[model samples]
Target: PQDMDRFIDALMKKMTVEEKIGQLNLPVSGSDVAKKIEQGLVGGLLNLKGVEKIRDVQKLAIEKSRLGIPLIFGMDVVHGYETIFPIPLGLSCSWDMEAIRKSARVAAIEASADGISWTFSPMVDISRDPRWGRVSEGNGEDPFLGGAIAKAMVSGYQGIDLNNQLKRNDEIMACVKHFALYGAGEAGRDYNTVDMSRNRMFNEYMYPYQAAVDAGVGSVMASFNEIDGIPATANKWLMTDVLRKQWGFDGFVVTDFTGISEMIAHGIGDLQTVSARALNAGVDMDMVSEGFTGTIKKSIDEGKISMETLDKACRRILEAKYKLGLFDNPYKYCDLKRPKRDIFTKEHRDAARKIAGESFVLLKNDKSGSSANPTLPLKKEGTVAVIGPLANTRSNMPGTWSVAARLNDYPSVYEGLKEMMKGKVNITYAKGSNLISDAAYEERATMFGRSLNRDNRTDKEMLDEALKVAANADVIIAALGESSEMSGESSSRTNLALPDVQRTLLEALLKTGKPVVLTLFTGRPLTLTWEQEHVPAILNVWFGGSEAAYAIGDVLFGDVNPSGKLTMTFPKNVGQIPLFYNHKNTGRPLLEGKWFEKFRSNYLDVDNDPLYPFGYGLSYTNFQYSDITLSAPTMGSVTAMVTVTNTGKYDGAEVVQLYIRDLVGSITRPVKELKGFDKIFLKAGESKTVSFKITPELLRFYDYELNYVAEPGDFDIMIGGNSQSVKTTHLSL
Candidate 1:
């Protein structure tokens, strides 16, 4: 460790003022990139690909530059590299920390092998609003679950040490992005203003970011939105006072894309002023903004910036490179042979398939027609008609934020099903409808090569073809929902329901006298009340990455029982935009079992309750829970136990969730806060006793004065499969 400090110190001593300023400038791969690297005018380069190109650029920094400080290559390796896994939102639903960790681990291995050293990943922002397109990149609404995922992702990327020491060539540095309350943007719009009380910030939205820092994330990317009226890139109280001083995050800080320059339009100031403020506020790297390299020298001469600040920022960058062992081996990640050996391998593909299967949440399964059992785990001998715009699309399977995926290489639902059920089940397919009714809207949703090849024919024409195919089929699987680009950065939707054309197409398929299974593909929670009521079965497959098609087949054929739980609540309509399970009880909260009351906090058209509560998911088998029992009535710590039995015919896995509610507190608390959960596998007719150790720390929350403390009181402990229906008991702490 001392050697690392000494090495950085020696390196910084040799860096000139211009070079130091250059170290704070992170530019995109563009014209004169080689010239900039050679002149030490760039700290890092993002969006650069290929081992040959990276090695060449890195050589320019190491051999051509004066100080020979190696540059760190960063990319948006958020979920997976080549053998893609589920989107982050889908991955969170899995609720299996081991699988989540392994996903990140595989991503790191493949990324590092592809000449990437740093990844802007594990975007731990907690968002309850499904309209925020970036929710596809986050963990979910609950701070507890998001925090657990943050730790797992950081550990997986940086290894268990988390000290920036890359012991293996496969390991890469992880950066937690959009720090602060970016997810709480107004109107659920991306990059909109974020405003909240300190209590809400600390107790609700701040946990996951802190969790990432506590897990030793090497870099932090400031959110584009303002925090407390100041842009997070220039918010001293956030970047310095909280992130560095209070949280003790020793890693370097970087601005999101053009974060500093964007502040000028944010009415902060010109680029020079905002850049100076950002540096003073603890930002070390100005991503994609030449603000530092463009004007820092003038600011320093005018006394707007200090030499000490410049030196500190430069040292952090150098220290990061040292921690990555980049100095010892400039070509550490530049092995031309690695891509063939590590990326998109058969082993990684298998893992992706299995993880994707676990990520599918069975949102609906109802008995239909003559079937006594629920319409799931479909019979393998049936003639399955898979029809929709999404049925045969290869590019959309990988989902959003998968920049490294070979879009054309992955299979579609029809192709994968035919290959998977070869000789056993007959498969037919048709493009039943376009993604949406409006051509312009469809174009917007299908951007970035994720097109469904929109049919020029009228909706009725397409529906007729699909119906003709479904007439002879034993079952119809209607694939419909958002395209990959429909729910990621800058793609927020005003309406959360399925596109109009697709919904109509689905209704037509249901009238074919055959059982219909709605295979819903989306990147966020959508309004599905109509589908749930009419469709015999529905599987919410949130764009399950490259092997998603195959994974759907596995779950559909009963090879893998779905165990994913909803990390975000699903509303019946967009009126419940910010719906979440862990909300505070209002003064005029609707009375229990009462649909509506005058002057109460109830909607006239809809109930306050969500259509599907958080942690809601169905398996092929039924899991029944026994009443919860506690070890003590009052104590420093207590153990809560519950017996969960597999009551259905099939063996399956279930996530036993534990929640606690404070009867009294200095501040109003959520009705229930998730404290712990255990995912257990049970055989048919078998029972498992799941135990959760409840300590005072788990009960701690931010009080009225913003102090993190646990007040002594009677608490309600709830345990069940989902948030709404749970067995409750009392505890005192």
Candidate 2:
């Protein structure tokens, strides 16, 4: 790695002002993009596709450029590559760190094989508001779980060491992104301003990004949001002081797409001023906007930025390329054979199919039989009516940030269900309704080629057709929820309710008297109070990827037990916008957990409890948890154990969760915080003890002054199947 610095330094010495600025100038792909690279006026390429196309540009740079410094290619390979997996938010629900890490590992392999050396991924922001469209791209709600997932993703992407692994094609340098509170945008709007106390930032929002750095991620992307009235792209304290000085991150900092020039709209300054501010603040690479190439020379002349500082930024970029083994061999990722050998291999697809099923959360399973048959592991012999707007399409299967995916190649719910029960069961499907009744909203929801094609028939016509199909079926599998475009990027919605057309369609189907299983598709938590109440069975399948249909089939038919838990809280209504399991207990905490109390903090119209609590999910089999047993009452690293037994007929997996609360703190602590969890599989009638170690480290939190310290106090500990129903124990910290 030191040799990388040495080589970068030597290379920087030979670069001219434009060439140095070129190292910071990352332009998107086009015919003219390579001309700049040939003149040593481009550092990296973004938004390019195909290994052959990437290699074509690489040839121009290494052979024609002055210093021949190689270009680093980057993409937003967020979820999976050609073989897509579930979205990040959906993937997080699995609570399987090994699977989460492996998803990123496969993505890195596929992306790197496709001639990408870097990925702007593991968008590890902690978000609670489902109205935030980008939440689909992040780990949900809890800093601890978010940090754990972040660390795992980085480990999967970088392997043991990015520099050492970069020599091989399997690894790609990971970019821990949307740095510094991008998820906490106001009103759950994308790119909105964020204002929070440093204490809150340190305690709540900063852990995952820091965790990514802790895991040795090679790059960091500046967020689009402003923190404390300063755009993150030009915020000196955040980028330099906190990110580098405090977090001990040695990685180069790159901006989100056009992050620098966008500061002009932030009222920071014009291009020249913001470019200088950004560089001086610690951004090592300017993505797409070319603010550095357009203005760095002027900034140097005017003394707004110094040459030494520019060289430092340039050297960091060169060092990233050097570490990527591009300087050693610029064509390292340009293997034409890799597309056939590495991308969308059978092994990757099988892993995707299995893991996709594991990501599904069984939300409801009502018993209609004397044996307590949980209305799931749907009997393969029955006629299943698979009907909804999303039931028969492949374009929306991969969900969001699956940019390079061939979505149409994937199976739809109908296709998947039919494939799984090819000879075993009789299945029928009908397009129940459009994603939305309104053509305008349907167009908006179906953007980016994730179209349902908008049936020309009226809503009544579609519903009638669905009912006719349902008449012949013994069971109804309602494949209904948000379309892929409805939950990613600029797709935020104020209402958490399902589309009216889909809800009506479901209601119509339910009245037909057949047992219905609501197979929901959503990228974020949806208010499902009605679905929970009326639907005999509910399974949340959050846009499973390329092998989505096969995976969904596996879970629906009981080939794989659904073990995923809710990573974010599903509120009773949109009134509880930022609902989460952990929150500060108010001075007037609710009396006796009642929804109404004259002087207490309770909602007047709606209950305080969520429709489904975080970490809440049902299995085909039942797990009974024994009381929490502690080895010691006081913590010098004490062990708390809970024995869980599979009480039902079928074997299944459960996510055992441990939560903690400090009675008193320097500052008020959350009512409950997720400290540790284990996802375990058990056989029918099997029992196992799950244990968690509690130490002062787990009890520590940021004080008012942002000091990471733990205070002596009584603590409440809970080990449970979910947040609400838990076996409690007490300990002294």
Candidate 3:
């Protein structure tokens, strides 16, 4: 077993300045690497996958390059490698770490088989902005839960040791990334500037990255965003002093896609200067920063940088390759057959279905025996109409972060439900409307190339057919939502409203007067005020993924209890796009004592709060929150616990949430930051006690001096349903 720090230190002593500088520059593989690889050194390469391709490349460097140091090729093997699992956000809904770990393990197995020595994934950025399309790539915006997922992923991908029986030494080095909060791109736009207070960043945003590090992630990728005016790639406080020196993270650091070169656009400096700065910071691999391709030698020769700095970078990358057993057999992970057979296998699909079913948090189940206006779950013997743009569409089911897997691998909504239902029910299907009929975006919406057609029929034709199906059916399963392109990088929407055509279709379905369950697919938070007011039941399925059909059907048939929570805030309208769990209190915060003023920081159009606050989710059965209690009133070292009971009829799962708020601080503090959470399962009428241990560090954040500190203050510890409504206990230190 390689002690990460010891291995890195030992390797650094053997690396030369050119090799070190080479390691800091990563050129993209395939077409990008086809052009040329610098002779002196190139530490890492990105976008390189498959065993045969990489084996040749590694040989080129080891046999031809001056240093004879083999390069560690990295790829974004997110979700799963050859075996495609659900996207990270979809996987988060599962909250089944065993399943998550297994998915990662299989991904590593497949990736390693394909000569992928490292993976740039388990992206653990905590995000609450649905508008940011990249949210689909990560576990949503709760540090406690996100951190747990991060650890599970790292452990799964890396195992105890890649060299162990579970994985080969040439297996993948799991790279946890976006080094900082890349998902919080301003206004949900990609690669945008990010600004946040230290308390919020430490307590909420950065914990997942920390969790991955603690779990011994082999590498970290610096994000593209600028944190506090400094690009995360070149930020010293972020990489060296804090992540390395403070947290003691000794693993290698790789900048995101040409991130060092992109810093030129960040208004930092020219290419030559920024390359040196990034190297001087803690960046180990440049990842296609060609700026470092030309600048490193000049800087070293001019005494602008020292050989020691270059060696340090080279050592980190070489160590990663060593840990991966790249030295022994550079071709270990190069078999092409590995990806085809095991990736998205039948067993994997079955697991995806099972987890997807369990992940569904049933929002509403209105089927009752009463005839007059009965709406609640009950035994029914009638035809069911499965209608929507998303119905029968398998590719779209995997949503935004869906990787480039073959289309046939996905299970369509109709097919999955048919499998789950065992052909018991008579079902009719119709595409009520295009996911978005807006002529301008339809082309891009259908980019996945799945044969998806909106209700191209006339208004009369659509209504007539829907009525025909409704009249014959006892229940209607109406699927509605933004197409897969709705939320992801550059997928920001100014209006987070239900598609107009879907709304019209819903209007028709509502007239049927039969119980209708809205199976909704969306990438970000969507305001469904009309649906909330009118629809009997609404189930939000955020890009349910491959087995989406089966999982959704399971939830409909009461086979699974949906327990997934809202990872981001759902504002009432786009007017409140940037709302999240962590907002600071203002000097003139809303008060009951003061009357509504014309100039207050309030929105007159809508409430000054989100429609659905962060961590919000609905289960078919209900959970009862018990009285919250605290062990101490004035100490950071104290612990607090609360008891929750599944008082509902059906067996259910509940996400026990813990949030904290600093009443007073040297700087302004958010109203609450989700600190801890526990997902517990209980049968009908079962109770469990959830406890949270408090520490000074949990109460700490970066100060103005860039020092991590916890100030003595009054803090509110909250436990409840969501971030907005939780019972509180006070603590002071």
Candidate 4:
């Protein structure tokens, strides 16, 4: 650690004021990038690929720049690289920390091999609003689960090294992004203003970002939104006081794309004023804004920014390069043959397929008529009709934020089912409907080459052809939902339901009196009340990655039992926008088993219940959970145990979840908070006991004064497969 500090100290002493400010400037790759790097006017480059190209640019900085400061190459490797994994929300549903970590690990290996040293990844913003398009990029509604995933992803990207030193060449610096409540945007719009009390911030939203810091994530990217009327990029309390002092995060802070300049639009100040404020707020790198490089020198001369502040920011940038071993070998990630051997290999594809299958949440599998079995795990001998816009689209499989994925290389649902069931089942394919009835809206949803090939035929024609295909089939697999681009970044939606045309086509197919399996593809939760009532089964395949096609087939034909749980609540309707399992009880709460009351916190038309609660998922086989057993009635810490038994005919895995409710607190608390969970596997008729060690640390929450402490109170311990329908026990602390 001293060696790194001394190295940066010596490097800083030799740098000019312009050079120091240059270290804080991160520009998108451009034709003039080589000239800037040579002049020591560039700190980093993003959106640049190819080992050869990166090697050339690194040579410009190292061999030609004044200080020879090696550049940090960053990219949006959110989920995976060439071998893409499921979107973050979908990955969270798996509830398999190891699998999620392994997915990040594979992404790191593939990315670093192609000459990238940093990734703007592991987006841990805990989002409850499914209308937020960026919800696809987050861990989900619960801070506990989001925090766990944040740690896993940080560890996977940076390895087990501490003090920001990477242990392996494959390990790249991980950036925990969109710091401070980017997900809780008003009306689920991207870059919208965020307003919340400090209590809600600490107890509900801030946990995952702090967890990433605790995991020693090498960098933090400021969010685009404003927090408490101040832009997060310029919020001193958030960026400095809380992140640096309270959380003890030593990593450098970078801005999101043009985050500093966007503060002007937030009505903060001019470019010069916001840039100076960002530097004082502890932002080390100006990403794509050029605010620091263009105006910081003048700000320093005008006494708005001190020279010490500039040096501190410069030191952080240099330190990141030092930690990444960029100074030791400027061409460390520039191995010419690494990409050929590392990217998109069969082993990586297999891992992707396995992880993708695990990410699928089986929303419904109902038994029709007097049949003993559900519609899922389809028999291999049936004529299966795969119909919908998504059924034949190869480009939509990798989901969103897959900037590096080769879209055409992945198979469509129809292609995958046909290949997997080659000699056994006959698979028929048909375009059931367009993505949406309105062509203009369809164009917006299917942007970025994820087109569903909007059919020129009329809606009736498409429905007739789909019904014809279903009439000849024993089972219908209707692949219909949001396309990849419909739920990431700026793609928020108000209507969280099936596209009208697709729903119409589905109804027409159901009229054929055949078993219908809705192979739903989406990035966020959608309302499915009618589908729940009519469809025999529904598999929510949330943009399963490059190997999604095969993974969908794997779960459909019983090759891999569906085990993913919902990380976010799927509302009965979009009106329940902020619905989640964990919410504080009202003074006049609706009574259990009652739909409505005169003066309760109940909607006039609908009850306050989610279509599918958080942590709810169905396996082909059933898992029965026994009553919880506590090691101690009252103690500082206790171990809660539950025996989970697989009662069905097939072997399966279940996530035994542990939730705690502080019955009385200094302040009102959520009805229940997820504290711990264990994913256990069991054979048919077999049982396994899962244990969770609950401690006072798990009971602590920020009170009125923002002091993190646990209050003496009675607590309810609930353990089950989901947030609702849990077996409850009591404990006192």
Candidate 1 residue 89 C-alpha distance from true site, Å? 0.4
lDDT per residue for candidate 1 within 436-467, as digits (tens), equals 88999988988999877776688888988999
Candidate 3 local lDDT, 174-199, one digit each (tens): 88888898977887678999998765
CA deviation > 4 Å runs, candidate 2: 161-165, 369-372
Q: Could you tell me how far off, in angstroms, the CA of residue 169 lies in candidate 2 after the best superposition?
A: 1.7
RMSD of each: 1.0, 1.4, 3.7, 1.0
Off by over 4 Å in 4: 161-165
Q: At residue 368, what lDDT does model 4 achieve?
A: 92
TM-score winner between candidates 1 and 2: 1
Clashing pairs in 1: none
Clashing residue pairs found in predicted model 2: none
**Cα RMSD for predicted model 1:** 1.0
Question: In angstroms, how far off is 311's CA in candidate 4?
Answer: 0.9
Q: lDDT (0-100) at residue 582 of candidate 1?
A: 90
Every model's TM-score: 0.99, 0.98, 0.88, 0.99
lDDT of 1 at 50: 82
Model 1 lDDT at residue 146:
96
The C-alpha stretches of model 3 lying farther than 4 A from their native spots are 1-21, 31-44, 55-68, 94-99, 160-171, 196-200, 267-270, 335-342, 365-381, 448-467, 591-601, 629-639, 702-707, 710-714, 730-733
